[PDB]
A paper describes a structure:
An interesting example is provided by the UvrD helicase (also annotated Helicase II, or PcrA in many Gram positive bacteria including Bacillus subtilis) which has been implicated in nucleotide excision repair (NER), mismatch repair, homologous recombination and rolling circle replication mechanisms. This multi-functionality is reflected in the ability of UvrD/PcrA to interact physically and functionally with many different partner proteins including UvrB, MutL, MutS, RecA and RepC/D. We and others have recently shown that PcrA/UvrD also interacts with RNA polymerase (RNAP), and this interaction could be important for the UvrD-dependent backtracking of stalled RNA polymerase.
To test this idea, we designed a new shorter version of the PcrA CTD using the homology models as a guide. This construct, which we call PcrA-short Ct (PcrA-sCt), includes residues 673–724 of the native PcrA protein. Crystals of PcrA-sCt (with the histidine tag removed) were obtained using the sitting drop vapor diffusion method. The final model includes all of the residues of the native PcrA sequence (W673 to V724) and an N-terminal glycine from the tag linker region. It closely resembles other bacterial Tudor domains such as those found in RapA, CarD and Mfd. Several highly conserved residues cluster together on the surface of the PcrA Tudor fold that frequently forms a protein:protein interface in other systems.
Numbering used by the authors: 672 to 724
Write the structure that this text describes.
């Protein structure tokens, strides 16, 4: 699934970079760093409004 360094386009926050991935592969939790001033958001990958790249 998701990997550190991946870029994600989020419906709300635009494009950001994955800085942490945890939980098991079936319930990944992502930290995604969006450019200033949004900062880092922590969210469950399941049902997240994100697309890779």
């Amino acid at each position: 699934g998701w990997k550190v360094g991946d870029r994600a386009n989020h419906r709300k926050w635009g494009i950001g970079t994955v800085v942490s991935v945890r939980g098991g592969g079936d319930d990944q939790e992502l930290d995604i760093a969006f450019p200033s001033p949004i900062g880092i958001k922590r969210l469950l990958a399941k049902f997240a409004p994100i697309e890779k790249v």
